[PDB]
Amino acid sequence: QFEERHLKFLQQLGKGNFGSVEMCRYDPLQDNTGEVVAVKKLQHSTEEHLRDFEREIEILKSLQHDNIVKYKGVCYSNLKLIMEYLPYGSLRDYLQKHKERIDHIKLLQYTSQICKGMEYLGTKRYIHRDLATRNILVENENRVKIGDFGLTKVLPQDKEYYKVKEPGESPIFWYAPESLTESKFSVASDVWSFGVVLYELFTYIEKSKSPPAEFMRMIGNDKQGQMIVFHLIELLKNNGRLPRPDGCPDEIYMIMTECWNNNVNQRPSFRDLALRVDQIRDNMAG
């Protein structure tokens, strides 16, 4: 395992749900020849959150895929999850800062990699529940990886869905209708979120074009607080949806809209999404 005393703090990487990820140098020979790693810990350790974190850690190390962040180990005294450090950071920050370097062909390359990572999750009956570009990490210009699994759950053997309502704030603008109304999470709800991720990528993370900003504008910024979810539910019920991003090809927007089907069973599979995206990639190449 990783020893506490040999882990040197370098900087804070992010804060989500109930954790924090820090950039650290694991230097066991204290001879600055050690590798930099990412360390995740609960920002406020609760026994309920500790049990969830333990599960999260088991989920991540049971995963080995090119498009999933690598598990490196754990650190015991306050439990800490040690993961590989991806130098380019989250896709959301990377894309926002590098839009001039990233074209549509590369956006589809990332899209394809995200789908393959998700199809791999589904093969283990894992439901991510938090897909968004901020949870995708960039290893290099050509490779992205799903980098966080804090809300990931395992489907029960007898059901094709999982019910769960956690205390606090949820990323409601990335949530499928049945996740908002019934707290139901499934591969199909991950697909709905994947559609939002696709939307995100093609907006190049323009601040005014974010899902929260767009939906709040459609719902009315003169909205309340507890009623926000209620109005979001109604908007989606009446087929209100995120607009086609500026410059987005019509065939890409259709993938988005198909993922945003109110009918859970009509949403495409991740396997099919990969095939349609790779087909469009090839048609844009030659």
Ligand SMILES: CNC(=O)c1cnc(N)c2cc(-c3ccc(N4CCOCC4)cc3)sc12
């Ligand atoms: C430039 N290098 C990096 O920044 C970097 C490198 N390697 C990594 N493995 C990670 C992981 C990161 C991270 C940051 C925020 C969250 N959140 C916020 C969203 O909600 C989930 C919790 C999770 C993971 S950053 C990062």
